[PDB]
């Protein structure tokens, strides 16, 4: 019943383990172990659920353990201890074969084949911890263990590809405790978390591991954002070193989102436009990455309205994301109709929701944008208009006040007008026929250059797999 | 054949409370007769919500009688011979009753059976039309859409022009029913040449509808000819009030008589747009869209005009014109400004090489984005 | 003007009639719109074929 299923579960892990072990221990074929390792994680997280979750326990018992046994006891202790033949090494089915690891020679210290198996165990535990939702004692114990465990080693490039996954759960576990629950000690250990990420980051340039380095930069930036240290983030990214080379397009989407967020609040919207569009493209558009997508699409809209661009009303409608973008929809219209009072009520009403995503502080700036837009509508509709008429139109208090809005706006070229004091009216000045001018030349030039860059990317990618294939024997 | 479409077209009017209360109660007479005669009883229950047990007792009776007759007839037909032709013909007839009572579900079962069995190509197309017609009765866009796709597989195998007329017009109602007019105009002007009333709203309706769509879609010459130099519309005169109003509009647009344009615009709203089930939903966009087309047209021929001039021509006050113009301008079809203090109306003139430049880059921009999206995808492999 | 038979514009507040005998817009730019136009259809097709690979 129990015995049967546990065993079965055990077997499956063991099969997977041996294969990836073989690959690494038979020369550097780097890509193959890596692709395999990612898929195995999914597979392992999916497995656990059924065939019983004491697959782990069984496997620990039956290795040449160093302190995995000591760890495992801590894990069973949190969630109530049992004993049913769980004594360390109560299972011997290794039986002096190198394959499942020669029992005698490992103990003596003439071989140490425990190395990567311990690393792998830590990965299985982390993974199992977050799946389960086991916290407190374990998280702390786990963080504790693994940091000195890694610093015992002097990692290989292949072993670093593997801790490129372990640090994401380390980060995330610390956060869960900090997020549940107020402590002075949370605050204190936030400092220590940064410090270690930063140490590992210097090392991963020298080790030549693009994968690890990327991951660390994602984490560190995210850390600056939560505690609201914008200044810290702005300094950190400008010693830019983030590679797009070896990294998943999953990782690219996260990276570019952080870029966008920090630009947003200091009023740089030109750079933020491009990075944001890219993260949308980059992201795998699937059922459970849908959370990411939603958060992002709320930002992308903000960035646009701040720039002065007006997002479609069509977009929010035909999306399957309608309901969440209900507040958004109200802002888009409110800027369009140029009604200040409605804008003011709208952000107050939505205050709680907006505040979570912290887009709220952007919304407050959107108060200027309402007014400014109303002054463009008036310029387009009526080329020559007495300053008296605008005041009535936008409900603005006196002649002197409208003087002051147009005057600040035309510095930015939004309205693109000039006030004629003498005559007591305002003249639009954008009057087209820029064909005759040198202007289209400028425009096309950028397009031409952009094509060329797409060519070089295309040419480059295409040829590379053939090279590997052609060399290899093939029928 | 006739009751199939007529019941629904007539009942619509009664539903509406848009219409005058007085008009609403006159519709009630006609609709009421046909509820009882045709025994519309399941559906009627639905329809009472939206605004004598005998009808229904009658239903139970009729149903049972009819059922009982045909039942053992079809049970006798099974003992007996021919299953291709004669049983298929009876199975059509069960569906005919089901279509009478307003259950779309029960007609669809029986009429499918006919298709299954190996039948004449001519016969095939026929049966599929009827299934799709059941959708119109309720007016559902999703059901109609999918059925009419199949009809095209068989349409050229049969290769009859008889049923392809019916096909053209069915797809026409599906289009009219939704906002898009581009497609409708093209099928519905053609139905002027050839109409078949079979399970289809009478020719007079088609005359009126063809004219509305006409205006919205074709440019000057072509459109004018299609909605005027048509022999058919002249022969048919103005026999009902609704066809009159729309034609009056057409005359005034074309003739550039802009005094009478506005009175004619208001008439078409009351008597064409709202009686129409199809353009009920689209009343709002349509009437507004006409004010923009007409204004554009006057402006095209004029470098500059006065507000006082323009205002007078239409028959609105000077203030009114300004307000209504300020709606049209940022949306952009008029291509114009108003230099207000002076009271002159200027019309920006970038129609030239500059125009062609601006358009061409935007189209280039659209191709550029698609290339990136696709590029990036393959590149990951 | 609207039929187009001298195809000019009437300037109402200056009460002058401007006449332009300029023929229809330059051919070259219009022919570009047709070329770019085809290319959009080429790309839609190219992505469906490429869907299998992704």
């Amino acid at each position: 019943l129990h015995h049967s299923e546990k065993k079965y579960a055990e077997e499956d892990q063991v099969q997977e383990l041996l294969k990836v072990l073989n690959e690494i221990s038979k020369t550097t074929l780097t890509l193959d172990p890596r692709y395999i390792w990612r898929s195995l994680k999914d597979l392992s997280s999916l497995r656990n659920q059924e065939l019983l979750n004491a697959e782990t326990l069984c496997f620990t018992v039956n290795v040449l353990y160093p302190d995995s046994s000591s760890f495992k006891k801590n894990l069973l202790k949190f969630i109530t201890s049992n004993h049913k033949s769980s004594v360390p090494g109560s299972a011997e089915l290794r039986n002096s074969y190198p394959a499942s690891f020669y029992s005698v020679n490992t103990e003596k210290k003439t071989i140490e084949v425990t190395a990567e198996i311990n690393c792998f165990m830590h990965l299985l535990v982390q993974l199992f911890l977050w799946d389960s939702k086991e916290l407190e004692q374990l998280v702390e114990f786990n963080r504790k263990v693994v940091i000195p465990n890694l610093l015992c080693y002097y990692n290989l490039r292949s072993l670093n590809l593997i801790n490129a996954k372990l640090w994401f759960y380390i980060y995330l576990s610390h956060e869960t405790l900090a997020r549940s629950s107020e402590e002075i000690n949370s605050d204190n250990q936030n400092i220590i978390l940064r410090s270690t990420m930063m140490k590992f980051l210097k090392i991963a340039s020298l080790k030549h591991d693009n994968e690890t380095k990327a991951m660390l930069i994602n984490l560190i930036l995210r850390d600056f954002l939560n505690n609201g240290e914008v200044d810290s983030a702005s300094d950190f990214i400008s010693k830019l070193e983030y590679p797009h080379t070896d990294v998943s397009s999953s990782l690219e989407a996260r990276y570019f989102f952080y870029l966008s967020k920090i630009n947003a609040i200091q009023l740089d919207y030109s750079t933020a436009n491009e990075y944001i569009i890219a993260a949308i493209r980059k992201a795998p558009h699937n059922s459970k990455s849908l959370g990411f997508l939603q958060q992002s699409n709320k930002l992308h809209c903000c960035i646009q309205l701040l720039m002065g661009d007006i997002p479609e009303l069509s977009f929010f409608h035909q999306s399957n994301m309608q309901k969440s973008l209900l507040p958004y929809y109200h802002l888009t219209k409110a800027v369009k109709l140029g009604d200040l009072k409605k804008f003011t009520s709208t952000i107050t009403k939505y205050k709680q929701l907006l505040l979570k995503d912290d887009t709220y502080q952007l919304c407050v700036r959107l108060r200027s944008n309402v007014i400014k837009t109303g002054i463009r509508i008036i310029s387009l509709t009526y080329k020559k208009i007495s300053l008296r008429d605008i005041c009535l139109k936008l409900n603005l208090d006196s002649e002197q006040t409208v003087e002051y809005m147009v005057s600040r706006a035309i510095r930015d070229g939004v309205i693109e007008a000039k006030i004629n004091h003498e005559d007591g009216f305002i003249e639009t000045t954008e009057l087209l026929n820029i064909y005759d001018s040198e202007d289209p030349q400028q425009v096309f030039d950028e397009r031409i250059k952009f094509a060329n860059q797409l060519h070089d990317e295309y040419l480059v990618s295409m040829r590379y797999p053939e090279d590997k294939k052609t060399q290899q024997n093939e029928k | 054949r006739v009751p199939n479409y007529e019941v629904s077209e007539k009942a619509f009017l009664l539903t509406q409370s848009k219409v005058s209360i007085e008009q609403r109660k006159e519709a009630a007479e006609f609709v009421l007769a046909k509820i009882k005669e045709e025994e519309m009883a399941p559906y009627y229950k639905y329809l009472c919500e939206e605004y004598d047990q005998e009808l229904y007792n009658e239903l139970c009776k009729k149903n049972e009688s009819k059922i009982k007759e045909l039942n053992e007839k079809i049970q006798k037909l099974e003992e007996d011979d021919e299953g291709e032709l004669e049983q298929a013909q009876a199975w059509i007839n069960l569906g005919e009753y089901y279509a009478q009572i307003g259950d779309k579900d029960n007609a669809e079962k029986t009429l499918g059976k006919s298709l299954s069995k190996a039948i004449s190509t001519g016969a095939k197309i026929d049966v599929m039309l009827t299934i799709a017609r059941l959708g119109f009765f309720y007016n559902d866009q999703l059901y109609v859409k999918e059925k009419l796709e199949a009809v095209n597989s068989m349409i050229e195998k049969g290769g009859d022009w008889e049923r392809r007329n019916r096909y053209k017009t069915y797809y026409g109602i599906h289009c009219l029913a939704v906002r898009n007019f581009k497609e409708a105009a093209k099928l519905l002007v053609d139905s002027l040449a050839t109409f078949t009333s079979i399970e289809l709203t009478s020719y007079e309706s088609i005359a009126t509808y063809a004219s509305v769509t006409g205006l919205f879609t074709l440019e000057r010459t072509d459109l004018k000819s299609k909605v005027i130099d048509s022999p058919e519309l002249l022969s048919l005169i103005s026999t009902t009030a609704a066809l009159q109003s729309i034609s009056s509009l057409t005359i005034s647009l074309y003739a550039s008589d802009y005094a009478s344009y506005f009175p004619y615009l208001l008439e078409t709203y009351a008597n064409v747009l709202i009686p129409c089930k199809y353009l009920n939903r689209h009343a709002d966009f349509f009437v507004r869209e006409m004010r923009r087309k007409v204004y554009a047209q006057l402006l095209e021929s004029y470098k500059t005009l006065s507000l006082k001039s323009m205002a007078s021509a239409f028959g609105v006050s000077v203030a009114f014109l300004d307000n209504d113009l300020g709606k049209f301008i940022p949306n952009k079809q008029l291509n114009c400004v108003i230099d207000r203090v002076n009271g002159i109306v200027e019309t920006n003139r970038p129609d030239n090489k500059n125009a062609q430049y601006h358009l061409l880059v935007k189209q280039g921009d659209g191709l550029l984005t698609k290339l990136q999206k696709y590029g990036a995808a393959v590149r990951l492999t | 003007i609207l039929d187009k038979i001298f195809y000019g514009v009437l300037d109402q507040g200056n009460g002058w009639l401007y006449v332009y005998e300029t023929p229809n817009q330059d051919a070259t730019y219009d022919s570009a719109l047709e070329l770019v136009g085809q290319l959009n259809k080429v790309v839609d097709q190219l992505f469906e074929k490429a869907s299998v690979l992704y």
Partner: peptide
């Protein structure tokens, strides 16, 4: 052409795999 080289490349992954099985018999 980008697409055409990638179809070819996908195909050859399978051929490379099977190649090994053929060599096993040969040895």
């Amino acid at each position: 052409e980008l697409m055409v080289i990638y179809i070819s490349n996908l195909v050859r992954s399978i051929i490379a795999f099977d190649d090994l099985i053929e060599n096993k018999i040969q040895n």
